[PDB]
Amino acid sequence: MPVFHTRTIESILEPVAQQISHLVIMHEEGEVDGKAIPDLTAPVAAVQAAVSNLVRVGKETVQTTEDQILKRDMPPAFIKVENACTKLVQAAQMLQSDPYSVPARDYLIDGSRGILSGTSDLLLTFDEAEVRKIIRVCKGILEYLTVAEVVETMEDLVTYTKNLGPGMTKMAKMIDERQQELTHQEHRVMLVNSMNTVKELLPVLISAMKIFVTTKNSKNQGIEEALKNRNFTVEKMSAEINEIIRVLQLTSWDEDAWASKDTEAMKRALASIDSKLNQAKGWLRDPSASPGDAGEQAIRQILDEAGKVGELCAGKERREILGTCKMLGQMTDQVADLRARGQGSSPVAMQKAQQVSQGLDVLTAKVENAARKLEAMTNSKQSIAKKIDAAQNWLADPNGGPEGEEQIRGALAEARKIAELCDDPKERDDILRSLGEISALTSKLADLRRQGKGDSPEARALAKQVATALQNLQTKTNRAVANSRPAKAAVHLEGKIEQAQRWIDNPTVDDRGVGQAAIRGLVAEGHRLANVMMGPYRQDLLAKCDRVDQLTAQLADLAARGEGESPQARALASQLQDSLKDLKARMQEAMTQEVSDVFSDTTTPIKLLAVAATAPPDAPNREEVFDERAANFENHSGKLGATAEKAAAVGTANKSTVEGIQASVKTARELTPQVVSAARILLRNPGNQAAYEHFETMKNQWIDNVEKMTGLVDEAIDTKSLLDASEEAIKKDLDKCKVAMANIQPQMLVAGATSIARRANRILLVAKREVENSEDPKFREAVKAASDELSKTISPMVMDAKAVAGNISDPGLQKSFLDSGYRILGAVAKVREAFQPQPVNQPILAAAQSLHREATKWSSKGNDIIAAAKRMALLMAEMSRLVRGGSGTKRALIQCAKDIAKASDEVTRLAKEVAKQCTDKRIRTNLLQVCERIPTISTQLKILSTVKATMLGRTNISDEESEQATEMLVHNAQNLMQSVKETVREAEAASIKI
């Protein structure tokens, strides 16, 4: 396959394929029009010269570079290119004899593919080696990690504190080489953002090591908690290093990410169901304890996370978790109806207090059914990706060995077993296709039964066809999960609109199940948004949530009775589509009300934990205060993480901002135990001088983590939305200042004056971060200036608070406080005041009209990015028939190779054109990250469409590899035009910002 693993490989193949394109448009009169050609016999030797240079180094790389497996695979590679090139000249030599010789036109069309596959192989095959030594570098590091528990003593500390140096500095220089070598934002970003984690936390690993000798100064057998905290980061060192091992091994377009990035969600979920197990079910079992806000909230946290389990599995099980959870919702409100009146809850729910419980416990077992199957479904994809390589191993160099046949037939016994474990009852057409191919693969395995004496002359034709048989397996085993795993929720919210706007009125991806998960996805968050409010404000959102819930199944049926053209089917679709638009501004405005109420006192228990970190047992209650401060820490943090990830998945952010949140909240998910772990050991070995800075380390980790996140959640939501949900929020809190002055409450003003300064400091912090991202000097000055007005008045509120706490029954004095309070909030309001101003492949024809709905968001004709998007998706419509068919006109397919890249290099330009006029860093940076994959994938379509041109109309065309050709055609145009959707949107989204 014509890979694009390296910047160099693109920089050569497009020079390779530029004239093989021009070679085979001569083949258009060569066999389609069937007539004589002009003498392009010199471009023959030119592209020979364009490959012989890498051949003449590739020939000697077999011998000069002393690696073993390069000697194995290269003589398959370039000799095929040599077998191609020798046929090219003789095609022209037979065309020197004859103006148009029927074999000679077929000899040249024979070689025109084998170069392009071969050159893409040759440029890959030793770039495969360039990655390979970096593995053993990392394997050197990963096993020098393994040294660092064999090493636990100080006499090897400063040695290996130095020995990391020529490893770790030698790590990053190879990576920062390779960081320039890839050409995907999806790859370049996830490489280095795992590479900084190992270099940042190796001093933290050293910080564990430097404090372990301090514990080793204390007596043994109570000190391995540090080595377990070492093992904490070392398993993270096991984690983030292993990630970038296999990132560089990917060497193509990304496919197995989503099957892998859903493994994390269930173990996020199933732990969270285990963690929210006890406190949820108690309110279910206590009628007369809480009226529906404390453990009732954790009840719905169980259900809306198990609802996120059911966003993964397939079939009718996509309904049976939805059907179990939604019917559990009303019956809790049937329980909530009882204690709203009171008499029904304790005596009368002798039956009712168990039908709710049985719809949780078997629901726990029902989502447990989706647990181990979906681990094992993504699993053994990699095993059958590995047992083919074990089959690829010996079948390259057989040497006529009949006991190498015996181990290559024993290795296929495991390669047998996987597809029966990969069997599903759904794709019965493909299952008999799969299971029928397996015994056929044992029959070409049974070719080796006749070789009592092994035959490489049999094996050279055996490996000629078992290699095409294994890629007939792997391109079908990955389908055996792809048509069995439903289409995922686009994690940013505007995708879940788009994954469900067009979904409801079309049978196409009704076979796929995009919106059926996505609508189940989208109101599993407004369902969780309504979880955090009290009694009466739980229902007003749930009434909009239950609106879609009863708009759910009554559009699951109208695919039978008519379609979207049917009148009340369209009306129920129109009732559903109108239901979601007023489920926007009561979802994200529901969100931003929460974030200005969770992140207020953003770190106040931690300075209280710092009080708990310093107080000896000479100070009173060094344990139970230290418990409840940590209990205040651990449970406010549960709000802190969960408020962020909701504001992640609802807030309009970059993908890099969303995963930037998603990793940082994951960083919060274990550092919050580490803050507990840091405050622990300082109180285990009491009052160490060397443990305070380690506590101060993880604190100023977590403070830097949270004051990243505090700033980074502010990257997600609107700053119009934060202030308005803060100015009104501080307004009642200055009205809370009015209630505690009417009675004699000094400390409630002392708790309140902080509560201003908990937030009024942060309002200044958001204003400065707005300025440094702003560049209009008239429209960044007041955000600096009024923040400094806020700076002018934050400190006198602390001072007169001490003046009025000493005398609470002093009108005038407490009046002067609230009058000093009166000066605050109008200036706080100023912050948002500045913010006021036929043989057709289907995924071709779908992706054309898919792009058109996105560019029709803007409704004018001025800037030609919509004319760029016009020519974009329209000029794939002609090649809809030309993939899978249209055997003659190969020339239009390459005419489509160029014009699409010509469009997706034009909109490359205009994306970064207005980015040069983009008046915000964060808007330009997010525009820059996506726009570098506009030209990269464009030129790849110059290759791949030209590759299928040789795969077109020969009539010796294998419809496995023509399918492999047309898969890479259509998989491109998805990833092509989905990036173009992000382009023509965010160009307009940056257009108003000027």
Author numbering: 1 to 837, 960 to 1116
Reproduce passages from the article.
Vinculin and metavinculin have seven four-helix bundle domains that are connected via a about 40 residue (in vinculin) or about 100 residue (in metavinculin) flexible proline-rich linker to their respective and distinct five-helix bundle tail domains, which is called Vt in vinculin, for vinculin tail, or MVt in metavinculin, for metavinculin tail. Vinculin and metavinculin are held in their closed auto-inhibited conformers by an extensive nanomolar affinity interface between their N-terminal four-helix bundle Vh1 subdomains and their respective Vt or MVt tail domains.
To further our understanding of metavinculin activation and function, we determined the 4.17 Å cryogenic electron microscopy structure of metavinculin in its native state. The initial processing of a single ab initio three-dimensional reconstruction, including all particles accounting for best two-dimensional classes, and subsequent homogeneous refinement yielded a 4.17 Å resolution structure that overall resembled our earlier crystal structures confirming overall the auto-inhibited conformation of metavinculin. The local resolution estimate suggested that the central core is well ordered to 4.2 to 4.5 Å and contributes toward the overall resolution of the metavinculin structure. The peripheral α-helices are in the 5 to 6 Å resolution range, while a few of the surface regions exhibit resolution of less than 8 Å. In our cryogenic electron microscopy structure, we did not observe a definitive density for the C-terminus (residues 1120 to 1134). This suggests that this region is flexible and in various conformations. Out of the three modes computed by three-dimensional variability analyses, one mode provided a glimpse of discrete conformational states presented by metavinculin in solution.
